[PDB]
Design a binder for these strands. Structure first.
Ligand code: NA
Ligand code: NA
Length: 319
DNA sequence: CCGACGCCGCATCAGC
DNA sequence: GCTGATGCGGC
DNA sequence: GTCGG
């Protein structure tokens, strides 16, 4: 736990302060595989056999193990610029660029943000408004309640809407972090249109039953906002609603359910058997390497069929 | 040694 | 006003 | 920062 703590700390710092995005992904992967090793690590070199752990992280692992600290992370926990940037990026809509600029002109705390509302954009004010509620997990039976509303609410506007709640939730996790719902209708396909306001008429509707309460961003395919159960008053939760063409929905569902490691191996195994998977389509590879036209997917198993894989129910789409 | 490392929708801004 | 670039969240 | 062509 200590090692993966430290690694993750180095990641957030490289993302938020350094803006070294790839250094951040490297610490992240380094931390994930260590978090999965089933022994207490005893030397740097030991982890060095792992994929993503190289010469510099193992030198840090040795220092941590020898001393219980990392001098570099200490210098970073001092230095008020780094910590205030890092803190401010916890506000949704406040990224490394906004955070750095804020601290440059003295905007360092949540309260500094309150006093400077006029200096925030809309997404940032909402993120600030729900700062504490957004950092708190969503337990399963709450999602189910949240599921029961979106599915039932979107059935009312048009029973030919098809909606699926994905993420950890549908893989069966007991905790969720937000609510990812995918959405389709007979009108909308990659070849055409037939209906202008499909995703609008969902959002307008869950607004009227006062479930959706704020909008971070909205257009004709992606919505981002806040939602909440009816009344203690329930905490506000993040929700995304994604409208996807029918011919790509099930590739959408397969993708947005995960995990990232299950898509990792299914995509790589698809290549073994001659197919390439993206969040949209499964397409064949000519023996020259060029992809063909998208195959048809009517259900999730169709994708599993092409690459000749036994279907893995979302519950065990972990590895 | 050295470039790759994720790619996209929406909001906002720079630059005309 | 237009269009293209960038910040942002996040699977 | 680690990996691989
Ligand atoms: Na290694
Ligand atoms: Na943020």
């Amino acid at each position: 736990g200590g090692i993966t703590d430290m690694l993750t700390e180095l990641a957030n710092f490289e993302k938020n302060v350094s803006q070294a995005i790839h250094k951040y992904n490297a610490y992240r992967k380094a931390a994930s595989v260590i978090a999965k090793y089933p022994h207490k690590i005893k030397s740097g070199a030991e982890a060095k056999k792992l994929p993503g752990v190289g010469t510099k992280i193992a030198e840090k692992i040795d220092e941590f193990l020898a001393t219980g600290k990392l001098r570099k992370l200490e210098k970073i926990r001092q230095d008020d610029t780094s910590s205030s940037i890092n803190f401010l990026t916890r506000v949704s809509g406040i990224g490394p660029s906004a955070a750095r600029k804020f601290v440059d002109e003295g905007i360092k705390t949540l309260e500094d943000l309150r006093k400077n509302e006029d200096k925030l954009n809309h997404h940032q004010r909402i993120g600030l408004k729900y700062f504490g509620d957004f950092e708190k997990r969503i337990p399963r039976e709450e999602m189910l309640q949240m599921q029961d509303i979106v599915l039932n609410e979107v059935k009312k506007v048009d029973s030919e809407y098809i909606a699926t709640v994905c993420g950890s939730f549908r893989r069966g996790a007991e905790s969720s972090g937000d609510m990812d719902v995918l959405l389709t209708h007979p009108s909308f396909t990659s070849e055409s249109t037939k209906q202008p306001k499909l995703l609008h008429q969902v959002v307008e509707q869950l607004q009227k039953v006062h479930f959706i309460t704020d909008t971070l961003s909205k257009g004709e395919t992606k919505f981002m906002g806040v939602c909440q159960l009816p009344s203690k008053e329930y905490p506000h939760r993040r929700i995304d609603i994604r409208l996807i063409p029918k011919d790509q929905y099930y590739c959408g569902v397969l993708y947005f359910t995960g995990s990232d490691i299950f898509n990792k191996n299914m995509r790589a195994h698809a290549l073994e058997k001659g197919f390439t998977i993206n969040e949209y389509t499964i397409r064949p590879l000519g023996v020259t390497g060029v992809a063909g036209e998208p195959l048809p997917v009517d259900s999730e198993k169709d994708i599993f069929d092409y690459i000749q894989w036994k279907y893995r129910e979302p519950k065990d789409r972990s590895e």
